[PDB]
């Protein structure tokens, strides 16, 4: 994930 972001998890799906 870009320097403006972090990996999160929503509903079991990882997303930046």
């Amino acid at each position, epitope marked *: *994930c*870009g320097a*403006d*972001s972090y*990996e999160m998890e929503e*509903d*079991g*799906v*990882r997303k*930046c």
Partner: antibody
Amino acid sequence: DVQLQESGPALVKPSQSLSLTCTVTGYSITSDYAWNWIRQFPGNKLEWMGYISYSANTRYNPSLKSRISITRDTSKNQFFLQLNSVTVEDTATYYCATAGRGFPYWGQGTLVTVSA
Amino acid sequence: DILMTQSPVSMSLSLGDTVSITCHSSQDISSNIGWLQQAPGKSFKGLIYHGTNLEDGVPGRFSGSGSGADYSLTISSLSSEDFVDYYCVQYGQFPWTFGGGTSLEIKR
């Protein structure tokens, strides 16, 4: 290895219901990830239909909202697609897939024709 | 919905060639893109997620680049098994959407 397999009818009449099963082995559908239906049209265009999450939350493509339901059976480790009021426009190859970090696991795909 | 425009639609290349497949999104997707591989007539394999991360057991010749709305899958030094179909997928906004695909064919 995690394995997914679609099953269901090859033919559904217009205005009837399309119902598919995805049988999951090697990983529990209650442990993690979202459990998706995707279809590929004649011509190869892909559409995301929706998912049921490991925690039972559903999310659906708005284009299909009035007609779609995704459900599961945790005892059998299976999840299901129901698509109502189908038309010839619903003829496609249907896939189940896992979304977690990208889309690592996919069923083999199953052709469903909608025709009278 | 987010439109994913994938290029080129098809390419003819030789063994050992390097190719980039690109996807442009109609809105910023913040690297929430995957690349999928498909043998024609068969099903899919996840190659890359979050724009750049290789899935387990994908060779170092596959790379991903891009940010914002423009991303590329690059295959450096094409091998025989690589001449198949490829698709991008965005999961940055619902509903999730796909690129139209790229078919790679080998010269002979």
